Amino acid sequence: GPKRGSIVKVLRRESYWFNDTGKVVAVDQAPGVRYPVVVRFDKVNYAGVSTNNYSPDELEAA
């Protein structure tokens, strides 16, 4: 998917970080992974976590 350390903006409609930016950590390049991109945000959600994984077609704005 996208490059490491790239700043991407989310499009997942049911995400706490929708329309927010975050820097990729490490996208897994396995053959059958459905949500390989891993992005960490600088603001926790209602549960307190700041890292989440998306699919490459689910978030991109650069």
């Binding site: 997942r12 049911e14 706490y16 992974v33 459905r34 989440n52």
Partner: protein, 80 residues
Amino acid sequence: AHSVKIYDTCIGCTQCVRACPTDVLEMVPWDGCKASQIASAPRTEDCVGCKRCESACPTDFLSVRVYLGAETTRSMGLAY
């Protein structure tokens, strides 16, 4: 009789099944996230609605969802 569901976003944290105090959720081989693990709810006839499962999955919104349905004796948590 409540309806548990496991959507295809579980990263195999195994916390859902560790937290459920009724032996309802169990791990299952399913390739695709990292470790070919996924959750599974075969024993939904025993869930009381504790929602300890949902309070553990560290996914974006959630990957295990409990929907409260018809009430019975097992699900009401009665001992009398």
